[PDB]
Assembly symmetry: C3
Homo-oligomer: 145 residues x 3
Amino acid sequence: PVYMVYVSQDRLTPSAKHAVAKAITDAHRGLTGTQHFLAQVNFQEQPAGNVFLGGVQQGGDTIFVHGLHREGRSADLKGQLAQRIVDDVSVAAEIDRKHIWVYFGEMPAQQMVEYGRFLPQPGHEGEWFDNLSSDERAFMETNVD
Amino acid sequence: PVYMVYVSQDRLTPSAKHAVAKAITDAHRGLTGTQHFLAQVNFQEQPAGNVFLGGVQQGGDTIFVHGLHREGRSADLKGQLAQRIVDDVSVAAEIDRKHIWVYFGEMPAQQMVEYGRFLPQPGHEGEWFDNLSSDERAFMETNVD
Amino acid sequence: PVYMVYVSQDRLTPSAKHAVAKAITDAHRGLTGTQHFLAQVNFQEQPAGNVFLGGVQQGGDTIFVHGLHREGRSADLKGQLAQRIVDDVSVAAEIDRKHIWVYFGEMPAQQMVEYGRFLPQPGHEGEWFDNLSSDERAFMETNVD
């Protein structure tokens, strides 16, 4: 997956970012089985005041998570995952849950590429990982916390 | 909804941003009936020069709106809403319609969370809001212009 | 289309940005027939360290391309397009392919607007372009590289 995480500049220190990104990553791994290194968290910071709700300018406590996933998972599991992202980002960023917005979009695995390679259907990430070159396997596996 | 609004840095003063957010939020409410405070406008600023059309670097005028909605509305209503965002953002930002691009993407409501809660189906914002607790009812009410 | 390109600050100079935008636009035109001026490449730069892979903070070399397209193309064509984007951005940005992520999302053409006008169905771009006003055509034609 790619999780784009929209936040205000300086609301999250680098350690708070590490905390948020590891909580989203753990959630995704623990609920889907997808290996840690296939999950990107991509922080998009903007000056405070660029977020409006009902037309009202917000301080720096708004978080929007846009998760981009392969098709194939159940509504039940995606609900559980969205809920766990809300809870665990609330703890990790010390931000009340009421500030957190989370949207999941889905695409055919055949039109998504990570590390320059096409993804597989969910649940066949193991033999997909095994199919590819030793250099790629090594580069991927360094990307696990 | 979340309306991601990509603009060049300093193209919109604080007052212009407020006006543009208001045009989008009032368009969404007026055509869908969804409450104002459920509409987010999230401005994403980047230096002029980061937008390319047909390979040609642009100045600071382009505006891209990526509206992210719940599934369930007709093509006709989405067309009316996109055209209204075009017209009203053209007015609010004193910008020619030819500079404005609008894309709507849709997601199951069961995988969309606002204010830490799962959204209802479109049109059921009323009972949804009537099952919300008093504090989150009030917090939501503070986000109306 | 709109190609949202997420890169670290300064990883692409203005000239490298122009090259990448050209690689993507040429690939889209070559494989779909869609005229150059209908392809937007929108660079989103963030400070290095905002990308995490498997929870591990990254340097400045990751590139994520989020391409937003009209529905209607084959899985085969979209695979060819995405692969060519990996390859040609690899060359233009002088970057290892294993740094390049590419996701394609699709929307009904009836909810996509470019230059203030609703897009046609894929493969009807010539006819659509002919039926625009001459001021709109002329503005679009200025965007060809």
